[PDB]
Amino acid sequence: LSEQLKHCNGILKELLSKKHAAYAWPFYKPVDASALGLHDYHDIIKHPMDLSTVKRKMENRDYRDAQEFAADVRLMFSNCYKYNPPDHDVVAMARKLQDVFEFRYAKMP
Numbered sequence: 001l002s003e004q005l006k007h008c009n010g011i012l013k014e015l016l017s018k019k020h021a022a023y024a025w026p027f028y029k030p031v032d033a034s035a036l037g038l039h040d041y042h043d044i045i046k047h048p049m050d051l052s053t054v055k056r057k058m059e060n061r062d063y064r065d066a067q068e069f070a071a072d073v074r075l076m077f078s079n080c081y082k083y084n085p086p087d088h089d090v091v092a093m094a095r096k097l098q099d100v101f102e103f104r105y106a107k108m109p
């Protein structure tokens with residue numbers, strides 16, 4: 001639906017908003033494997049995702065439907081939980097940001 005995609009665009013705006021920045025910030029941009037010294041990141045995560053890539057896709061009208069947008073947002077969180085140890089700080093942040101997402105996605109018309 002154009003209405004579902006519009007609902008998604010709203011969710012995206014909310015994910016990027018400054019009020020979530022204390023836990024959204026690790027997800028704003030792509031994981032820089034070099035800069036973080038993570039030599040195995042790209043071996044383990046075959047399909048990186050981040051919110052700036054989601055934003056670009058949205059702006060370019062690449063999502064044909066809401067399901068595609070959700071897939072990308074969940075992919076971002078799934079990569080986080082797959083790559084990192086379960087007691088990593090970034091995992092708790094992921095879960096907090098995912099809750100912001102999933103609540104709003106469940107209310108899509």
Ligand SMILES: CC(=O)Nc1cccc(-c2ccc3c(c2)[C@H](NC(=O)OC(C)C)C[C@H](C)N3C(C)=O)c1
Binds near residue numbers: 026032
């Ligand atoms: C916008 C901006 O400059 N952004 C930025 C800056 C520095 C690091 C990261 C950044 C990016 C991604 C991630 C991490 C950091 C995590 N390491 C870490 O200190 O995280 C918490 C303890 C905070 C590692 C992990 C690979 N990760 C994710 C999301 O799976 C992002």
